[PDB]
């Protein structure tokens, strides 16, 4: 039956006017100009590849000094007086109250132990990658008709007589990677496969995180001990911060650079300047009547967003229930996408029958204000649906 999922052409090579087959750096453009005989001008322009990363913003990674202080007062109870470290942003406290052999002179009590972090200094911003999308802008002008589109990696553009396909194993960054920028985005980031998430301890990568909703403080896994002169508190645990431990071995981690980067709340956009990342590009110009666009179809698709579940800004994603009506075709195998005002975040291939169908699409990314709509090609539903906030909370 009919289907538009195949993005490509059927051709007779004998009838092909021109074929291009080359490898191009991701960071390179390409321009080709030849006059086609009848003279007909012909222009093929491919732009630099653009990386689109849906990111979770993690805030500022913090450096700090580890401190422990004892406070022994002979007065009654431990809670009745408070202690100097309790003004710190992050402190962990243990109180040895009404226990014993340990009384210093003049005291016939409370022994307050306190570990806290001060000299807090931001060392860079961190982002966790939800999804990655690689696109290139391609413009084709055959005579007086121009066609421009943004082509995804491993996808093809089909015009009445030109087919342009890209194929590239471009994938240095991975989803759920953690990007750390010690400076402005322009100066590049560091990829960290290890970054604390479910069990952030002091000294872990990402231990102290200054977020917009306040500070996020690491647990101290060491053990306390009361020494018995006035008692002194002792802590057996990690003293050195996660930042200092990473910088000491910093050259162990993978960097990645960014040219002209643009950033929003949930998305990072740049061009990778590494000229070694190459994809394969194939262009075929074939003006014969037998040059068939494989995606041609007389089918019509009506879209309505039925329901939504799941979260925005999540590597788990959201699930979008679509009501897809099909007319003018007995069946039609196609792709239905989840898109908002900005762009799309996921697609599902279904086999549609005459009449109404129900189609569920899993999207990944988006923000609080994204109104995700069911989309086909450039046709989306009239209405969109907001998703739930993502669960990204330390348990502490």
């Amino acid at each position: 039956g009919w289907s538009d999922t195949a993005h490509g052409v059927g051709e007779i090579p004998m009838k092909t006017d021109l074929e291009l087959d080359f490898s191009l750096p991701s960071s390179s453009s390409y321009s080709y100009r030849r006059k086609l005989t009848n003279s007909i001008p012909f222009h093929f322009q491919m732009e630099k590849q653009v990386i689109h990363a849906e990111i979770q913003p993690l805030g500022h990674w913090m450096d700090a000094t580890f401190n422990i202080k004892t406070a022994f007062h002979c007065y009654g109870a431990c809670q009745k007086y408070s202690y100097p470290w309790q003004t710190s942003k992050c402190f962990f406290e243990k109180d040895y109250q009404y226990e014993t052999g340990c009384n210093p002179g003049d005291c016939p009590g409370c022994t307050a132990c306190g570990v806290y972090l001060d000299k807090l200094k931001s060392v860079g911003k961190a982002y966790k990658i939800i999804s990655l999308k690689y696109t290139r802008k391609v413009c084709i002008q055959l005579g007086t008709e121009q066609t421009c589109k943004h082509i995804d990696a491993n996808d093809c553009l089909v015009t009445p007589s030109v087919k342009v396909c890209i194929v590239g194993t471009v994938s240095k960054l991975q989803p759920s990677d953690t990007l750390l920028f010690l400076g402005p985005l322009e100066q590049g980031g560091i990829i960290l496969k290890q970054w604390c998430t479910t069990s952030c301890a002091f000294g872990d990568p990402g231990d102290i995180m200054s977020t917009p909703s306040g500070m996020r403080c690491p647990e101290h896994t060491g053990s306390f001990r009361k020494i018995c002169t006035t008692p002194v508190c002792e802590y057996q645990g990690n003293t050195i911060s996660g930042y200092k431990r990473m910088m000491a071995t910093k050259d162990s981690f993978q960097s990645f650079n960014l040219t002209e980067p643009h950033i929003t709340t949930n998305k990072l956009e740049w061009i990778d300047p590494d000229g070694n990342t190459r994809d394969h590009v194939n262009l075929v110009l074939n003006r014969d009547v037998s040059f068939q666009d494989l995606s041609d179809n007389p089918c019509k698709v009506d879209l309505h967003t039925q329901a939504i579940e799941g979260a925005w800004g999540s590597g788990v994603g959201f699930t979008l229930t679509c009501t897809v009506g099909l007319t003018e075709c007995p069946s039609f195998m196609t792709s239905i996408k989840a898109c908002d005002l900005a762009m799309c975040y996921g697609s599902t291939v279904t086999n549609l029958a005459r009449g109404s169908n129900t189609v569920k699409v899993v999207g990944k990314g988006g923000h609080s204000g994204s109104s995700f709509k069911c989309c086909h090609d450039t046709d989306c539903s009239s209405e969109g649906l907001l998703a739930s906030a993502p669960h990204l909370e330390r348990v502490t």
Copy 2:
């Protein structure tokens, strides 16, 4: 010399009857029907891509409550009486016996500390990915001759006059990834790059694991302390379970969905419903006498499984020593595979000489009952060999 490792054709494009070049979603089929002139019917059917993951079954991940109880009895010795927590599936015990200042009234002893987990609830099944294989079923009918085969990704099918090649960077899942299904497989899983393996502590991802051979209990890394009234036990360590720590930040991890999934002891089979994963498909129909199958060869290959070492169900794999006899050809460069009744798990390219050769193939996956045989194309040895059980034991 001769060689069948190249899966493809040499053609004259002028003599090509038809060429198809398109990108297709992994989750999409494709059908093409054109009448070839002489009329000759021609049908090209490509099916959805099927993901084959050799998995290590890890059992049920468990949620639990952390408990600590003290038991002080004045009677002699600590071992002589046992304690209530010792019926729990997972408990860790420390006994302060015959030590000191700490005696409560009426006692002129044993102080039993016990941390244990109860309210154990299964929260999902977990699997570690050994290997990944992406296949598509392709059927070609030129006139009255039909050819169907399952093509691996980045491989080609060659018929007397048709060449079909697939090229796809399809690889979202990675080997040694950990898949967690909070529900039935149908409802999808979560990818976890961090999952405890060599040092499972309480609070780690995968801390409490209910396996078929019984329970697998996490270590508690905290420290004990006897407080001195009857003595009270104190524990400085993580109280919150790994499950609760992950759910609190669940939206941080990558999901993956599965359509019509099928599961065995060591293998998970499904179709990825994400329509954004696209591979490149190229078909060439060329009926000219100069259309040469590059893998054509008059060579004959005899197979015998010599020995085996290594383990089934292991990402390290097993090594299969093959005795490969070659006749009717001076040399022959080919691929020798390790396959069982179900399918194949690895292949090795060698350069064979006239007579007997020894060829070692590394396979990954399989199960206890798999009888791995040396195979060439569809020809395998008569006899197979069982492999060793995999070493997948916590040290505890």
Copy 3:
């Protein structure tokens, strides 16, 4: 304008003499011989793929036994006497001096605790992967003119009349992976995604590391306690070494084998014997005057290395400032590379104008003696620059 970044050709398929399109194992060669009519001999030889991994050498991973000893002497002070474990390569010490109820008989003192590791045995060498590069040697002989080059994956070779392109999702190993060889390289390695780097504790993968600059000892995160007869030291912490914990579950990790491997200080070179890794190969022989090499250009490029910053042997890399003069062309979009005597480590695509330009290239890898030069094609600067030593130190 002009550009040589596109490695490929523009052709008329009708005028094509011969086209090859096949998939080949990475571990396979290929040879094709046909006589071209006028007879003209034609030879196309493709060699096995070669993996080039820039590695950071980590030294010998060590197995050990965990020991704890108490030393109580009644004499004055703890420092005045030293203790037997202090000859061990790795020991961690805690001294309970001048504290209290605990005095054994004949003593009216010092209680020395000592945890140490002995029976140290090397269990294998470990390497962290900086970067990966996949190359194949390809030779083309059309009549009396031969052209040989080493082609990178996803790149094309262009001769006056032949175009050879490779496209392959070949990427089992990943950058910043950790390779462990329990034996000689020939016998294969194990990939470890978890390998301690910023917080190496006893029991972590890679806990005890014998490096050329001496030993690297793990921290012991447990807690000490003085028991009160002469006092006994107690340690609550992990007793079992990282090696023993991995071997107990060894079959959980991914292996990779190596044929004829060659190793230097900063680079590992081999051929992957897995015959399932396949890339796509396309050859086009087209001797028509319209067969245009897309990289043809009359431009000339002068090179001078301006400055360098960053480190050799680092997954973060070094930044190379190049002075690139352009003559004979108004503009020229090209690739400028960072290479030393051995090979290249990175490239940057720029748009050059008439006259002098400044171009910054990020390289990854190299060694202490590498003199990195700015390069274009096979033309490099006369002078090179040394980079800084990488920061790869445990904080301890």
